[PDB]
Design a protein around this ligand. Structure first.
Ligand code: HEM
Ligand code: HEM
Ligand SMILES: Cc1cc(N)nc(COC[C@H](CN)OCc2cc(C)cc(N)n2)c1
Ligand SMILES: Cc1cc(N)nc(COC[C@H](CN)OCc2cc(C)cc(N)n2)c1
Ligand SMILES: C[C@H](O)[C@H](O)[C@H]1CNc2nc(N)[nH]c(=O)c2N1
Ligand SMILES: C[C@H](O)[C@H](O)[C@H]1CNc2nc(N)[nH]c(=O)c2N1
Ligand SMILES: [Zn+2]
Lengths: 411, 407
């Protein structure tokens, strides 16, 4: 079956056949759409088809489908599963798998880059100290003095689910948040709970507005351990504005390297529960969400004040005005410091080109509109006008519950 | 089966049970979400009638009463006999209000029960339709202090006698292609404008020519009428700080009045049911003005502001976008024509959602449409999970008449 998507700005119509390979479920039914819902131990039994399906895709991508090498690998994995109950990926397959998980990530606007991805195989890692070392090298390599390079580090796969490797941090680099006795928050309110965990684990909190959190690292199902990333490896950008000289006095900065560390990588039915990955920021992630969400730094009031905008009525659009100047500031700052960043026009325009190419070469591009459309100026970007089909391909990045909710404490 | 929706800004979680009365289908499956796609006999009629009448009598605390059973019997008698039936005024009013209440793509629904319903089921000719429409227009406009309204023409019968308003809105500007290659006026209306021209309209060939109405009665061939200019309230667009703004020659009309949709109540189909409210500022300032295939004025505005248009990362589009929207709200306010900004409107919708969850067990909502086309995440709807499902009575889309009409 064929499915058509239309662009309402350009009248370009695309045809999707790829959704026919989608097996995982969406949350939607013929009776309810859950497209805006944020979040809508395996047997040999279920494992072998998952392996087979992955290996068939891998071997097709290399133009070796049906080869002796293909058939031998299937036989080899089969036996490994039935005798050890799991199996090991070849390096080539891990790399391919990690790239495809990104390629398949329907909520990611940055997928034009999917084939340039540095893969660090950390499956020999055994201890939290070892994880710390891997992660520092990833941070250093990715950051590359501001000329950011995409990368992922892949720690050992799940076995019985009692020996999981986990990074407790949601991102490798994030700022602490501290709830004050008076109800106000110092630093990033999104990280209060994790910050408290860190403190309980023995972290000495500086208690400032932008303190880089320590890594909390769990190897092999053991209790997690704290490590401070060397500050010299943590690239930061002070935020100033090209015309507003008082902007620097707001005291803002941000880190250069967005690195997701709480997600689960699924490849051929194998589960990599610690697989931190990083790229580079789109301006709005910081200037819209991090700075201006009410539940985050929430700087809109202070910025509009300094601009002396009329704040007595929302219909002056004072918020919208301060929002734009803040985002100009973020882009200006990163560019002035030669730290890679992309604006939301450029990123969305690239994504449309990526998406069309994907339709041609691959028969589709699963995309989540709710996520792809930027959180400011939505309809003056080309993605707003683009119909999209959202479905689930593997390999994939999945959510997983927070480790402090499930961890069995050894003491 | 009982579904939770979370607000990620406030942690407020609401439980939705209303979806269990969902009737129509979504376009989605368990394999594929189509949430971002713009458009995805006697036997059939009595179930549809019963379901409606059941909810009606339920709304007036008379469920299971003799009056309930009696009407159910009468409508049944009427369907069996006449193959269709007629709504009581009370039911028609309830039906219309609920169609709006159920419009999952409408952010303005907190207003749903203050709706003036004009019953035009006695209409027989296109002239009569014109008369009804001018009255609707005048009543809703109300010298700028706008009031919501719907006018309901006779229901579909055998399908060869449809009433239809050919315009997509009661009030829209004409669109003209030129030898130039460019488009004069509203590019979205070019085709309708040609149909008008070819039906006989003499066009003034300007940028902002209010289109004539093209009215179809009783499945007859549609006829043209011009709305009395004095009834079409328009607003010249100026900026509270930029004096040059007015030089762009921008104006818009005050009354948003959708005329191309189909109202379904109790299984009956009202193919001509123009309805109107008042604008949210972004509909004009973001979409009408700045869409690339609309008036597309960002380039020209940015120039007058003298912004750096060399590089996308100066955010010159975004800067100019904000100013254009400041000017729309300011012009409507200054001339005292009701308008709502996207902050106040989405805040209203969040309070409405809470009322609906508390009072009805849910509120069907399409996030893709509810979140404003600028500044999404600084409005509270962005952070609100919504569940989208289709309840009846409903406004539905329907094929453009010229593709259907045998002359
Ligand atoms: C190259 C630079 C990149 C840019 C500009 C980019 C951009 C984005 C943006 C703007 C989002 C939405 C994030 C949010 O609003 O929270 C996103 C989500 C995502 N990205 Fe990309 N990305 C990039 C690289 C990558 C890489 C290297 C991977 C994996 C290898 C990846 C996988 C994902 C996944 C799994 C999500 C969804 C996360 C979630 O559901 O919370 N991205 N990315
Ligand atoms: C009270 C003033 C009103 C405001 C501020 C309002 C707000 C809106 C907005 C912003 C949209 C999205 C439209 C677009 O992007 O094109 C919308 C769509 C809709 N509204 Fe409301 N509305 C109002 C009155 C009404 C009334 C009185 C009805 C019915 C009686 C209604 C039913 C709908 C329907 C059916 C749609 C979807 C149209 C479509 O899918 O093309 N609206 N409205
Ligand atoms: C690798 C990468 C690059 C880039 N530019 N952006 C990203 C995305 O940042 C991830 C973002 C950080 N919290 O995750 C999104 C998120 C946030 C929240 C509050 C909940 C949730 N489920 N998911 C990743
Ligand atoms: C009643 C009402 C009030 C208000 N403030 N805004 C509206 C929305 O305008 C309706 C508009 C009809 N042209 O619907 C949006 C739309 C336009 C077009 C060209 C196509 C489409 N699928 N949907 C209606
Ligand atoms: C409820 C709603 O789905 C939620 O706020 C989503 C909307 N779209 C988003 N889009 C992006 N890129 N990132 C987000 O965190 C969100 N949040
Ligand atoms: C492709 C996408 O579904 C389409 O552009 C939608 C997105 N959201 C919208 N939202 C509103 N309010 N009005 C629209 O016309 C659209 N267009
Ligand atoms: Zn869906």
């Amino acid at each position: 079956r064929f499915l058509k998507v239309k662009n309402w700005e350009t009248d370009v119509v695309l045809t999707d056949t790829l959704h026919l390979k989608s097996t995982l479920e969406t949350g939607c039914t013929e009776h309810i759409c859950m497209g805006s819902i944020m979040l809508p131990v395996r047997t040999k039994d279920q494992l072998f088809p998952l392996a087979k399906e992955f290996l068939d895709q891998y071997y097709s991508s290399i133009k070796r489908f049906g080869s002796k090498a293909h058939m031998d690998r299937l036989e080899e994995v089969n036996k490994e599963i039935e005798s050890t109950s799991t199996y090991q990926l070849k390096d080539t397959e891990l790399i391919y798998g990690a790239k495809h998980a990104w390629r398949n990530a329907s909520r990611c606007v940055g997928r034009i880059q999917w084939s340039k991805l540095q893969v660090f195989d950390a499956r020999d890692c055994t201890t939290a100290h070892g994880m710390f070392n891997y992660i520092c090298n990833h941070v250093k390599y990715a950051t590359n003095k501001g000329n950011l390079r995409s990368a992922i580090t892949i720690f050992p796969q799940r076995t019985d689910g009692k020996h999981d490797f986990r990074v407790w941090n949601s991102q490798l680099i994030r700022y602490a948040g501290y709830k004050q006795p008076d109800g106000s928050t110092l630093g990033d309110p999104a990280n209060v709970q994790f910050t408290e965990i860190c403190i309980q684990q023995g972290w000495k909190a500086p208690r400032g507005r932008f303190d880089v959190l320590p890594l909390l690292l769990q190897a092999n199902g053991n209790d997690p351990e704290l490590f401070q990333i060397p500050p010299e490896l943590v690239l930061e950008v002070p935020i100033r504005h090209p015309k507003f000289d008082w902007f620097k006095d707001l005291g803002l900065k941000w880190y250069g390297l967005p690195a997701v560390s709480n997600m689960l990588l699924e490849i051929g039915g194998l589960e990599f529960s610690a697989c931190p990955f990083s790229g580079w920021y789109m301006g709005t992630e910081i200037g819209v969400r991090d700075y201006c969400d009410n539940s985050r730094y929430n700087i809109l009031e202070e910025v509009a004040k300094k601009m002396d905008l009329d704040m007595r009525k929302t219909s002056s659009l004072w918020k919208d005005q301060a929002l734009v100047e803040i985002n100009i500031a973020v882009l200006y700052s990163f560019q002035s410091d030669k730290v890679t960043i992309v604006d939301h026009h450029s990123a969305t325009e690239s994504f449309i080109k990526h998406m069309e190419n994907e339709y041609r070469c691959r028969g589709g591009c699963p995309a989540d509109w709710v996520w792809i459309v930027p959180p400011m100026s939505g309809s003056i970007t080309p993605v707003f006008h683009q119909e999209m089909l959202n479905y689930r391909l593997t390999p994939s990045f999945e959510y997983q519950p927070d480790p402090w909710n499930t961890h069995v404490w050894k003491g």
